[PDB]
């Protein structure tokens, strides 16, 4: 159910207006706290001595109504960046007064307009207000998609019309930078009569958009007179509905022969006819842009309620079963089916899902198998013992050890193990598998047979703000930027297509094994945008054509086990069209720990993040 409100400038009486607006079906009302035309003076002597109340008292509504139903709008006559000293001084005083009154009321949100090239003084006043007191109101910067000077008609003889398509965004960015990416400043994207190129909308959708303002003049007239959005505004509204922005319908009823509610109703219709969420999206709901630390099973034991979520995925284990089936068919010919017994070793059996998959694969392939299930977490070993005693029986042998420290009784025909993370090697799968190789038969195979990790630059002020919010005390203040986070990228914009890095193959039988890696990636850029970090995905080949992947263009259908990973950078890197982002990644180890270092070089050389694993390491 889409949450939408109403924007008004004439409010003769608050109670009646709220009643009517609620009756029409809106959720909240955006109004001016002070009368828009009631200019006020603070310096001039005769004028500033104005008696009587400045604005309607706050007792008019209950304390709850202000906190949920009202959104304050700054007076239009205020212009902090005026070029006249008296006007600017009065504007500063009035804006501070209005912000203070809004905070006093308890307003959930306050609207401020960005309809000028320069907003430095306004930003200064807003920043001063944000750092004073103990208020919590959010601030929505009403900024249009197309600057007013560009959408005006060409009816002036002395001045004909016409990077110019992006100027509005530059107004936002600068303002944001002046406020230092405050968590309390959001964007109220004011949609226009016509949309810009797809790239502009893509860049905008990466911004922290909280509300979208729809004028009543956008809607077209259908065959029966009801309002209807254009065919491209429809797609844009769908894209916004992918986010959870609130729609504010502004203007007057351009369709007098119909009730205003129609404008709302149509929106609701688009909300109800939105394409249904898929299984993956439904699974991921509630964790969009929710930073999480990766799992490091090699050093820290998992809990049962993590294996529970690991088991919900049906795609992963079906693919593993198919891979085992194909491998068993390939290795054992039909004539040798009777006596050829293949040895399978599951490494990291967990609570026995992969053991069940292997047994099922052998059963359907008609090939006999012996099974060794290795596991280190003793808690999972208890479950494996119960499974073995009750149901698997003699066919499965459970071992409680680390495969790097285990001494197998016989060599393995097939090795099966999933030890991958968001990044393919994030979970130290290569380190464990290389050690495990010592008990792998000469012609045996390993599943997965190979895995690669792909990296792609991203832009997301939301994620940058979360990373900054991960400021924990008793550690380096910059440490939060020097560690990866596994998170479902939702409010982000992809600057370029992912590229491969750090490929791994098993079994690796080169003369001297080395797991340290170094990769340099160059990403073209198509729009002036700010890079905030790099998102990492992984792809993997289990056996021949059987594969798993979370890369956006080849995502496995419905496989929701893994989320992308995020490597942030300390300072946003501004990049212009035609430039190339040159990032460099190092996977380093010292036989006791493993870490990742990353540095940007081409646009503007950045510092080497996480040197010598000072801020993030995986125990080995």
């Amino acid at each position: 159910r889409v949450s939408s409100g109403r924007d008004l400038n004439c409010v003769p009486e608050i109670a009646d207006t709220l009643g009517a607006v609620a009756k029409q079906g809106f959720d909240f009302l955006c109004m001016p706290v002070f009368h828009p035309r009631f200019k006020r003076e603070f310096i001039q002597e005769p004028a500033k001595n104005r008696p009587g109340p400045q604005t309607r008292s706050d007792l008019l509504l209950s304390g709850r109504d202000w906190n949920t139903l009202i959104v304050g709008k700054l007076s239009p006559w205020i212009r902090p960046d005026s070029k006249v000293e008296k006007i600017r001084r009065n504007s500063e005083a009035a804006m501070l007064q209005e912000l203070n009154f809004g905070a006093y009321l308890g307003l959930p949100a306050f609207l401020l307009p960005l309809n000028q090239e320069d907003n430095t003084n306004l930003a200064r006043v807003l920043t001063n207000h944000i750092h004073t007191g103990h208020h919590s109101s959010m601030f929505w910067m009403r900024v249009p998609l197309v600057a007013p000077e560009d959408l005006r008609d060409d009816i002036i003889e002395n001045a004909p019309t016409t990077s110019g398509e992006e100027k509005t965004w530059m107004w936002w960015h600068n303002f944001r930078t002046l406020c230092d990416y405050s968590k309390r400043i959001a964007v109220a994207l004011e949609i226009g009569a016509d949309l810009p190129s797809n790239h502009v909308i893509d860049r905008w959708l990466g911004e922290p958009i909280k509300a979208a303002i729809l004028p009543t003049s956008i809607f077209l007239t259908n065959k029966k007179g009801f309002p209807v959005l254009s065919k491209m505004h429809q797609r844009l509204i769908f894209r916004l509905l992918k986010l959870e922005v609130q729609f504010i319908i502004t203007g007057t009823n351009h369709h007098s022969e119909k009730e205003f509610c129609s404008y709302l109703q149509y929106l609701e219709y688009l909300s109800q006819n939105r394409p249904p969420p898929n299984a993956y999206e439904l699974f991921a709901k509630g964790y969009e842009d929710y930073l999480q630390s990766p799992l490091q099973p090699l050093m820290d034991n998992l809990e049962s309620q993590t294996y529970e979520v690991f088991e919900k995925d049906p795609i992963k284990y079906s693919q593993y079963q198919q891979a085992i089936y194909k491998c068993l068919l390939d290795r054992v010919p039909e004539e040798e089916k009777d006596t050829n017994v293949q040895v399978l070793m599951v490494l990291g059996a967990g609570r026995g899902p992969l053991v069940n998959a292997s047994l099922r694969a052998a059963k359907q392939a008609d090939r006999r198998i012996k099974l060794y299930a290795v596991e280190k977490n003793p808690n999972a070993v208890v479950t494996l013992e119960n499974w073995q005693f009750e149901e698997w029986g003699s066919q499965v042998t459970v071992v409680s050890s680390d495969m790097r420290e285990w001494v197998a009784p016989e060599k393995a025909d097939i090795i099966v193990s999933e030890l991958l993370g968001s990044f393919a090697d994030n979970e130290l799968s290569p380190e464990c598998l290389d050690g495990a190789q010592h008990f792998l038969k000469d012609d045996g195979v390993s599943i997965p047979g190979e895995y690669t990790s792909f990296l792609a630059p991203i832009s997301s002020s939301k994620l940058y703000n979360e990373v900054r919010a991960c400021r924990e005390k008793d550690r380096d203040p910059e440490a939060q930027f020097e560690m990866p986070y596994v998170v479902r990228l939702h409010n982000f914009h992809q600057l370029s297509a992912p590229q491969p890095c750090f490929t791994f193959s098993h079994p690796n039988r080169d003369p001297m094994i080395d797991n340290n890696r170094y990769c340099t990636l160059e990403f073209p850029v198509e729009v002036n945008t700010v890079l905030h970090g790099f998102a990492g995905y992984f792809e993997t080949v289990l056996y021949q054509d059987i594969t798993l992947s979370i890369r956006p263009e080849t995502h496995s259908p419905g496989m929701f086990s893994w989320f992308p990973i995020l490597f942030p950078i300390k300072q946003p890197i501004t990049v212009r069209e035609g430039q190339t982002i040159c990032v460099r990644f190092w996977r380093c180890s010292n036989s006791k720990k493993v870490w990742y270092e990353w540095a940007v070089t081409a646009p503007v050389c950045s510092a080497i993040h996480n040197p010598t694993g000072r801020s993030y390491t995986i125990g080995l």
């Binding site: 964790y287 999480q292 799992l295 993590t306 979520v309 596994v486 929701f560 989320f563």
Partner: peptide
């Protein structure tokens, strides 16, 4: 932590 995080 559902997904691949804590």
């Amino acid at each position: 932590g559902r997904g691949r995080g804590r």
